[PDB]
mmCIF file of C-alpha atoms and ligand atoms in Angstrom:
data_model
loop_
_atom_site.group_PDB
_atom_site.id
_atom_site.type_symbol
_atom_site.label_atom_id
_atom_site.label_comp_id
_atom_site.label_asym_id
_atom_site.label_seq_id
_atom_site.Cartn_x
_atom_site.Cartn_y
_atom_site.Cartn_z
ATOM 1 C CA UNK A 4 -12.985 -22.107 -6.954
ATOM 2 C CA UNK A 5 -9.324 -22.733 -7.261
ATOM 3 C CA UNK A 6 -6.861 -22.441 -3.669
ATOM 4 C CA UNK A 7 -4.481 -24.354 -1.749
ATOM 5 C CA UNK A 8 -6.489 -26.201 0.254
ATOM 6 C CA UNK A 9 -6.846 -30.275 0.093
ATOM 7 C CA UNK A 10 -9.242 -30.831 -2.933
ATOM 8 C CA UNK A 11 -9.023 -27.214 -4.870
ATOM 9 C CA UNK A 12 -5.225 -27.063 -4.546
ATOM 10 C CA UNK A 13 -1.995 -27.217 -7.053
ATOM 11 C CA UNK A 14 -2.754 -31.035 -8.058
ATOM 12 C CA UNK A 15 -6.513 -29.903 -9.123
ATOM 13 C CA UNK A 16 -5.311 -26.860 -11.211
ATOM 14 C CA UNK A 17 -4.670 -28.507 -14.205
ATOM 15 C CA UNK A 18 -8.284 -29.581 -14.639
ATOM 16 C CA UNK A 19 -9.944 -25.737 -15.015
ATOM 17 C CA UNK A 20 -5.963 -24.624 -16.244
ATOM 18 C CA UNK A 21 -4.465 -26.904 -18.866
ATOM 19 C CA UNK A 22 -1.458 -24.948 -18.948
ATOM 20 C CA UNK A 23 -0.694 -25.670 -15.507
ATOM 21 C CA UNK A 24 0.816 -29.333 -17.389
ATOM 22 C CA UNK A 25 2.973 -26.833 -19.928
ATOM 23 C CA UNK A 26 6.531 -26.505 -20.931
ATOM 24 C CA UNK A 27 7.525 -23.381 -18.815
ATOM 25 C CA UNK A 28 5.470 -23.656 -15.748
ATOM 26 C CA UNK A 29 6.973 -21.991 -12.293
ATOM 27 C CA UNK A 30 7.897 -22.275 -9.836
ATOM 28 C CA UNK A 31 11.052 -24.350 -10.273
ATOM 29 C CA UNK A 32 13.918 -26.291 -8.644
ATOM 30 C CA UNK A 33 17.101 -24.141 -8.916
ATOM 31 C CA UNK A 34 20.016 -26.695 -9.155
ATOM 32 C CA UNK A 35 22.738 -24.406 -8.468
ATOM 33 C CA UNK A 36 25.144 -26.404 -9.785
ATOM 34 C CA UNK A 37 23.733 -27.303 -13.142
ATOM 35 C CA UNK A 38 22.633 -23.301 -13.516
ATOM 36 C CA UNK A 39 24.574 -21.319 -15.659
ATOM 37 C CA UNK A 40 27.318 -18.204 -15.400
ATOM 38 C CA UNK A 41 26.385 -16.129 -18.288
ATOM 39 C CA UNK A 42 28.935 -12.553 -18.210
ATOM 40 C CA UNK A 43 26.748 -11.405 -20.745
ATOM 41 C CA UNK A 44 23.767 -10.660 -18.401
ATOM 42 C CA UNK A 45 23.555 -7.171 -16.943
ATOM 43 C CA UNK A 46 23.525 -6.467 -13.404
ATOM 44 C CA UNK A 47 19.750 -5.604 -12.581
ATOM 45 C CA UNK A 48 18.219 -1.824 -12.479
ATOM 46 C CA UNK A 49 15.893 -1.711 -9.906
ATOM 47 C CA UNK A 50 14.708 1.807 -9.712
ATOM 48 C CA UNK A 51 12.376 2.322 -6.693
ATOM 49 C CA UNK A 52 13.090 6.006 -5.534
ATOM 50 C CA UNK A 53 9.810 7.349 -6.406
ATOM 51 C CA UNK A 54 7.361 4.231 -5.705
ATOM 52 C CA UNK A 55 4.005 5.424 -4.700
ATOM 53 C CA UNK A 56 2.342 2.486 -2.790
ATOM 54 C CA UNK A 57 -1.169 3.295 -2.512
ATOM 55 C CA UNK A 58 -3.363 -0.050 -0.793
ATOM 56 C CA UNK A 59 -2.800 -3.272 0.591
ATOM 57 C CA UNK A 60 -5.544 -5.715 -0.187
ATOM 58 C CA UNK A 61 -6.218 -9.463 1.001
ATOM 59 C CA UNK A 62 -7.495 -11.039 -1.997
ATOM 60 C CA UNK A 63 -8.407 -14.609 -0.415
ATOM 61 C CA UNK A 64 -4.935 -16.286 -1.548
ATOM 62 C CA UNK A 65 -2.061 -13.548 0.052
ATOM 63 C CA UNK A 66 -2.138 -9.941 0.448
ATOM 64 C CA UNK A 67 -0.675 -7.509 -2.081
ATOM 65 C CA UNK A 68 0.705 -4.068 -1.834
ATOM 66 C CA UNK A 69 -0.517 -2.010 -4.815
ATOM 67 C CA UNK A 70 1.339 0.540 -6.275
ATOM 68 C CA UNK A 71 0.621 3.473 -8.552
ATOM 69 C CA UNK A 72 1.666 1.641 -12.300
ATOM 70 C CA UNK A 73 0.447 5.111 -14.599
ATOM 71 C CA UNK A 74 3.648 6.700 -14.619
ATOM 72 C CA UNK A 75 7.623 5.142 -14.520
ATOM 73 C CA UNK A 76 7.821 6.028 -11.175
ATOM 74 C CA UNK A 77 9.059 2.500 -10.069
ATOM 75 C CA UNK A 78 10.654 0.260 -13.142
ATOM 76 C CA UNK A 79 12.917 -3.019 -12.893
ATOM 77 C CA UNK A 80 15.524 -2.683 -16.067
ATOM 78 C CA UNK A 81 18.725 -4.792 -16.970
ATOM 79 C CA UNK A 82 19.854 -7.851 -15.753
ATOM 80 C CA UNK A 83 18.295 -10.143 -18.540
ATOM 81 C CA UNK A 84 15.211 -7.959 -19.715
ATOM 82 C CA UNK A 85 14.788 -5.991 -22.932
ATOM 83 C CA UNK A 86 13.032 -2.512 -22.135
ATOM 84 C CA UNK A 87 11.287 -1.167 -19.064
ATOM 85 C CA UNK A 88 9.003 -2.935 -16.468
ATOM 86 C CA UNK A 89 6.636 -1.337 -14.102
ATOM 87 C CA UNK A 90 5.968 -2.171 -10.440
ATOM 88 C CA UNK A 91 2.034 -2.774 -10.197
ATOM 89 C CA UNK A 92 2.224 -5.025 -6.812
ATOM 90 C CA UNK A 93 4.146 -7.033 -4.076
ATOM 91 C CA UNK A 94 3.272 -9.953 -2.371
ATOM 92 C CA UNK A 95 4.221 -12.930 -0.288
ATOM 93 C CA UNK A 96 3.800 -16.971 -0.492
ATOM 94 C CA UNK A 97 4.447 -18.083 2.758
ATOM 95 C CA UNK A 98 4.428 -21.489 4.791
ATOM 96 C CA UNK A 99 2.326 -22.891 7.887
ATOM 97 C CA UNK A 100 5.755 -23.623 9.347
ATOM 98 C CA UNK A 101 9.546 -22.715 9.270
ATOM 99 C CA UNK A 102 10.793 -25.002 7.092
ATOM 100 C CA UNK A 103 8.435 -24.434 3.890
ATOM 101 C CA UNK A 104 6.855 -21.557 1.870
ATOM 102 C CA UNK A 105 9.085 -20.420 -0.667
ATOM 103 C CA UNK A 106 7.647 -21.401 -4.428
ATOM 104 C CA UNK A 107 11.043 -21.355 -5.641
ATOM 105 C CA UNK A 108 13.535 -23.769 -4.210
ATOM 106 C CA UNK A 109 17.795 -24.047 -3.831
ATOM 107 C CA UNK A 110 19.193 -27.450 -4.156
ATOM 108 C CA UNK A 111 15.549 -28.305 -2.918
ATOM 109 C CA UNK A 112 15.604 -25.893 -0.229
ATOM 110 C CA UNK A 113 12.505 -24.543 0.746
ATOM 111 C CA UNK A 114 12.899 -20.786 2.699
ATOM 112 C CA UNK A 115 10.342 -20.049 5.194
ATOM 113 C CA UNK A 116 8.515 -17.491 2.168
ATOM 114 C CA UNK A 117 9.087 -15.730 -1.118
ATOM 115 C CA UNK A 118 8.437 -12.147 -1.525
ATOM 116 C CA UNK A 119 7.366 -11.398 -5.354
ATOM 117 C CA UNK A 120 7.646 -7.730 -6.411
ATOM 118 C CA UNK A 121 5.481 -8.264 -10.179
ATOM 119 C CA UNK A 122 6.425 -5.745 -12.710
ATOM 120 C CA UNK A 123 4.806 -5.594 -16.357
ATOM 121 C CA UNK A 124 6.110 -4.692 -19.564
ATOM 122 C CA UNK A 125 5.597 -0.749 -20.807
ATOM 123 C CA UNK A 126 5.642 -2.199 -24.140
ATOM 124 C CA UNK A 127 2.025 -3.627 -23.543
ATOM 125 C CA UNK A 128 0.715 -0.512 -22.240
ATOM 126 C CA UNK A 129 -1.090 -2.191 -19.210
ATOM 127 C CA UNK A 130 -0.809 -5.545 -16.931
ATOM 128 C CA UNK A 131 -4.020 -7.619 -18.700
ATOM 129 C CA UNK A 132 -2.403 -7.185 -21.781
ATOM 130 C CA UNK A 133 1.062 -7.835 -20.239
ATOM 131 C CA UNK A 134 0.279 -11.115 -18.912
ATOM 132 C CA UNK A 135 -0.435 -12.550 -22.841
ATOM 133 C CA UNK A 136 2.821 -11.822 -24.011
ATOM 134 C CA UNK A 137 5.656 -14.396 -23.554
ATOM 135 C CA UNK A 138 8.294 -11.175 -22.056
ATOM 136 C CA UNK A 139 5.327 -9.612 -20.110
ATOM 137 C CA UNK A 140 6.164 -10.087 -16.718
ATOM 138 C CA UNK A 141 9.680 -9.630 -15.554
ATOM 139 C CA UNK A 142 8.942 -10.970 -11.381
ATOM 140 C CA UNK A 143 11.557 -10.536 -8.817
ATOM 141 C CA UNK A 144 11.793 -13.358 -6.001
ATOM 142 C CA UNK A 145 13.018 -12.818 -2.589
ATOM 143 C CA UNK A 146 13.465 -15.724 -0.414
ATOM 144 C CA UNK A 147 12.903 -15.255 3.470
ATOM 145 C CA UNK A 148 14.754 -17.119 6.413
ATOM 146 C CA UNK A 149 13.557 -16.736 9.969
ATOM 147 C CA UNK A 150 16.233 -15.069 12.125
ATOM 148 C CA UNK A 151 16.871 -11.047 12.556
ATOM 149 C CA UNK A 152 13.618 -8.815 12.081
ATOM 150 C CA UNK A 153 13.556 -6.862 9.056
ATOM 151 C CA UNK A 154 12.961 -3.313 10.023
ATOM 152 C CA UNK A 155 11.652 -2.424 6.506
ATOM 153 C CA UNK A 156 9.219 -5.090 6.511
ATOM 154 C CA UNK A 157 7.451 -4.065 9.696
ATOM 155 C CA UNK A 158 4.883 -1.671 8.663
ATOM 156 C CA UNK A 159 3.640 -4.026 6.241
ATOM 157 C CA UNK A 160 3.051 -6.815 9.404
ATOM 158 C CA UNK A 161 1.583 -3.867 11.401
ATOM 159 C CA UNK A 162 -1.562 -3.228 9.099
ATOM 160 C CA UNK A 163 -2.645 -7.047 8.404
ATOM 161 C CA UNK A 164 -4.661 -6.898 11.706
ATOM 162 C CA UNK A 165 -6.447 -4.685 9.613
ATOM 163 C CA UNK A 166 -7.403 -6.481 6.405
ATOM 164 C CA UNK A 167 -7.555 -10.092 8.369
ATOM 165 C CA UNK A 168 -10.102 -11.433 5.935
ATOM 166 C CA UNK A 169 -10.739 -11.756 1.928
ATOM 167 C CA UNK A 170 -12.011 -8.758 0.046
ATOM 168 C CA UNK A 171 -10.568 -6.151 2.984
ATOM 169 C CA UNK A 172 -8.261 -3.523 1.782
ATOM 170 C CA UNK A 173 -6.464 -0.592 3.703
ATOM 171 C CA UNK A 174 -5.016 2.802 2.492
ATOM 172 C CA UNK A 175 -0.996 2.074 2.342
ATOM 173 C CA UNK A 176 0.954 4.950 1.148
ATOM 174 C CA UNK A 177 4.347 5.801 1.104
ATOM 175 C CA UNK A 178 6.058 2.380 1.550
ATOM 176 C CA UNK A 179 9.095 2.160 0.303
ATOM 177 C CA UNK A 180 9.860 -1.253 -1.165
ATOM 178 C CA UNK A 181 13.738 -1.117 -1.328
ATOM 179 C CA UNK A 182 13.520 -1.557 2.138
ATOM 180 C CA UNK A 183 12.473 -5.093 1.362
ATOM 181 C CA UNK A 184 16.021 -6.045 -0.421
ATOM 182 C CA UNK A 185 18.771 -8.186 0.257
ATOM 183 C CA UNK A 186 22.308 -6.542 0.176
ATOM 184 C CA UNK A 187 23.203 -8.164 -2.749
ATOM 185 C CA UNK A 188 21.342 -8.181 -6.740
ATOM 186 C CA UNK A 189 23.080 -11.413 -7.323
ATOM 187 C CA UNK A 190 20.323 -13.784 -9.374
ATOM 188 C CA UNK A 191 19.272 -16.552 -10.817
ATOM 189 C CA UNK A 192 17.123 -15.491 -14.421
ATOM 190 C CA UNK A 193 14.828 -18.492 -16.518
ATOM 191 C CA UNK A 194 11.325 -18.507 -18.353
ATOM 192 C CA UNK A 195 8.236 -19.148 -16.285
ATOM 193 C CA UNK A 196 4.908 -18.669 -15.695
ATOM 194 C CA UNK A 197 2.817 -17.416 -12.811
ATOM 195 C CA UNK A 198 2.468 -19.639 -10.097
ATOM 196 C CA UNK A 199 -0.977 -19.263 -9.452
ATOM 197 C CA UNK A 200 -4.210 -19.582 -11.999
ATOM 198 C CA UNK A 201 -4.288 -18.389 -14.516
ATOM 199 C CA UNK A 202 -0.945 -19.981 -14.972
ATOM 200 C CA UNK A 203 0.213 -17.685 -17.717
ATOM 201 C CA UNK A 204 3.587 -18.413 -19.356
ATOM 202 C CA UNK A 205 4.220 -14.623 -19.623
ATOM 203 C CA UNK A 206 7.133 -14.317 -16.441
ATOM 204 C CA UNK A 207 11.044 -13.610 -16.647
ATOM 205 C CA UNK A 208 12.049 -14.640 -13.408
ATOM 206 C CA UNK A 209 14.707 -13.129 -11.703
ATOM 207 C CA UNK A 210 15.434 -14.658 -8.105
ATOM 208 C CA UNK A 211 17.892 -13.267 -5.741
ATOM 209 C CA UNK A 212 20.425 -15.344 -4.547
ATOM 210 C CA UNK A 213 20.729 -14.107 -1.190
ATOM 211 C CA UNK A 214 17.819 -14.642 1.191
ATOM 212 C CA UNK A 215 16.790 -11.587 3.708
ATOM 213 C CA UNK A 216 16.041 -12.403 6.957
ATOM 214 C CA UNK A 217 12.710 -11.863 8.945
ATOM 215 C CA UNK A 218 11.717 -12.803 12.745
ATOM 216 C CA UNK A 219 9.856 -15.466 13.877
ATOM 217 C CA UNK A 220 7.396 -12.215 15.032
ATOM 218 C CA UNK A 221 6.805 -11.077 11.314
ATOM 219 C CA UNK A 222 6.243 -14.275 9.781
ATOM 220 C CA UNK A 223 3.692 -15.668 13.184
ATOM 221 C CA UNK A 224 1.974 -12.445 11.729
ATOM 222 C CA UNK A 225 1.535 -13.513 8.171
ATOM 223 C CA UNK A 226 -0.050 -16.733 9.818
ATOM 224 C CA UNK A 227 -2.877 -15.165 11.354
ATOM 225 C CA UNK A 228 -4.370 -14.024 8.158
ATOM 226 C CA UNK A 229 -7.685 -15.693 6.646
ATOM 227 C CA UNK A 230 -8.487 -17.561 3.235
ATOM 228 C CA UNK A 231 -11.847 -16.784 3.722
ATOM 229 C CA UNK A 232 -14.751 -13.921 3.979
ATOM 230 C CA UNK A 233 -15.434 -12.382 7.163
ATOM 231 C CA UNK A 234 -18.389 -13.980 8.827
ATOM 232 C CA UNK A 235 -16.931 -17.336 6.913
ATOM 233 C CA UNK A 236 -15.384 -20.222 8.817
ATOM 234 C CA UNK A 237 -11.576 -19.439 9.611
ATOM 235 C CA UNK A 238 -9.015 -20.778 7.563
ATOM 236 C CA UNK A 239 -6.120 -19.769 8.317
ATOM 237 C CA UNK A 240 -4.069 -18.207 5.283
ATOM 238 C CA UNK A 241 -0.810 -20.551 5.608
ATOM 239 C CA UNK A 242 0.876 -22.962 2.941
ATOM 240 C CA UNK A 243 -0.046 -20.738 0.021
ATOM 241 C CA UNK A 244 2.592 -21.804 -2.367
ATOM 242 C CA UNK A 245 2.833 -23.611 -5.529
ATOM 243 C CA UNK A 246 5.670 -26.716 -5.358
ATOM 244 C CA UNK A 247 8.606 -27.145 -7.766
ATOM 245 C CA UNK A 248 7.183 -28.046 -11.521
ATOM 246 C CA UNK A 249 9.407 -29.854 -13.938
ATOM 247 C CA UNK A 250 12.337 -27.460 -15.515
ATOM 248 C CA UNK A 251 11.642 -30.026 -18.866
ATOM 249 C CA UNK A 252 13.643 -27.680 -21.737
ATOM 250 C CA UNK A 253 14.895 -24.535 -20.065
ATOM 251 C CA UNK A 254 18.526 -23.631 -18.739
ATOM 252 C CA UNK A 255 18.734 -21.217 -15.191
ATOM 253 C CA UNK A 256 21.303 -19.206 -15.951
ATOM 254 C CA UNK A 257 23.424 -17.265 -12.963
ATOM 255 C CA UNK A 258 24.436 -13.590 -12.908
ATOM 256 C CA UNK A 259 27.395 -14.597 -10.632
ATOM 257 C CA UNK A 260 30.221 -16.930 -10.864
HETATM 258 C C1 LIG B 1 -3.712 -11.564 -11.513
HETATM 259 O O1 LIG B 1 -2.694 -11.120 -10.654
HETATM 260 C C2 LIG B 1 -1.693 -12.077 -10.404
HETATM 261 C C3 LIG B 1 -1.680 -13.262 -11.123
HETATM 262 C C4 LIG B 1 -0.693 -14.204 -10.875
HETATM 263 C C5 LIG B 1 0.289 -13.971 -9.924
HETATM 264 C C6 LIG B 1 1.353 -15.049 -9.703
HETATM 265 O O2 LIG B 1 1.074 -16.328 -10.135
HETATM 266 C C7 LIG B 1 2.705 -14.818 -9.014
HETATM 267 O O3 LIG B 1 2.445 -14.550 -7.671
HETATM 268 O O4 LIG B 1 3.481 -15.977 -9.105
HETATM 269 C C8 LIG B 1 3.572 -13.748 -9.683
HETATM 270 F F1 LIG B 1 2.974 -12.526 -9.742
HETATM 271 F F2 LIG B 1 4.748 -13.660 -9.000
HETATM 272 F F3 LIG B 1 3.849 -14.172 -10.941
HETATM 273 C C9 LIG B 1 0.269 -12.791 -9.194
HETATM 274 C C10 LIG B 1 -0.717 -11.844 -9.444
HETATM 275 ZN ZN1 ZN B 2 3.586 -14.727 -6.128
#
């Protein structure tokens, strides 16, 4: 089926995913210059004080932390959305080296990963319907530079050892995902899509401006993870990131001067 590898990857998409040629496909090329101040943006609400985390799960393409979406317990609100979004899952797109693995790029930038903390809209009443609607995903991007260890990130790098291999899950409560932020809310806000099939054009994104910083250690440990089934032939799970699609007839606007 579809991956990142060198004949199922982002170029071969399109053929099983038409949209994947669309007008608001992610991720995107954030020109910092050319995006936009806009006052009238809100600062962001991220409420995460009573997250319940509950699994993490390698699904063949990254791993995601799962989180308990049946109640508001954790809800993004402000910055540019209208209403309430739900925290279902967090994941990570990360590079076979340093110098790529973020989705999103700055001036053409490309961070070492990019954490994605996927909320849906309570509106819809669930994520499947969510992902139909044009304002059904509001997705918060976190870029990652290689430098000081990231204490809050740690017990996430502890249990991959433990799901090395598609299909494995692992019991993963109380993880607190605000230990996963950068100091500042600062952000970049435009319409997307997801950035892997199905391709849906159903994503506010809202990208931090400022990157957080994880070791060399923590990332190696991402790296080690596989693509493929136990009892499969190793491939490693590296390089699993979509590159910059064409902005065509959308503005990034800035929450910061
Ligand atoms: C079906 O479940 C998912 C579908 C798509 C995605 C993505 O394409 C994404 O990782 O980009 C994000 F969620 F950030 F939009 C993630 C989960
Ligand atoms: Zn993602």
């Amino acid at each position: 089926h579809w991956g990142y590898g060198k004949h199922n990857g982002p170029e071969h998409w399109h053929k099983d995913f038409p949209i994947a040629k669309g007008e608001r496909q992610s991720p995107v090329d954030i020109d910092t210059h050319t995006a936009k101040y806009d006052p009238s943006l809100k600062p962001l609400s991220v409420s995460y004080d009573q997250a319940t985390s509950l699994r993490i799960l390698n699904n063949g393409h990254a791993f995601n932390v799962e989180f308990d979406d049946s109640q508001d317990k954790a809800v993004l609100k402000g910055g540019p959305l209208d209403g309430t979004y739900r925290l279902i899952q967090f994941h990570f797109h990360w590079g076979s080296l340093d110098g790529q693995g973020s989705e999103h790029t700055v001036d053409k930038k490309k961070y070492a990963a990019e954490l994605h903390l996927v909320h849906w809209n309570t509106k819809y009443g669930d994520f499947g319907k969510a992902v139909q609607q044009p304002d059904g995903l509001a997705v918060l991007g976190i870029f990652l530079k290689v430098g000081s260890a990231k204490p809050g990130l740690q017990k996430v790098v502890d249990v991959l050892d433990s799901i090395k291999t598609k299909g494995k899950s692992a019991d993963f409560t109380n993880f607190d995902p605000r230990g996963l932020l950068p100091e500042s809310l600062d952000y970049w806000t435009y319409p997307g899509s997801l950035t892997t099939p199905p391709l849906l054009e159903c994503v506010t994104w809202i990208v931090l401006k400022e990157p957080i910083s994880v070791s060399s250690e923590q990332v190696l440990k991402f790296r080690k993870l596989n693509f493929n089934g136990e009892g499969e032939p190793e491939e490693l799970m590296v390089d699993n990131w979509r590159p910059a699609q064409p902005l065509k007839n959308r503005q990034i606007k800035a929450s910061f001067k």
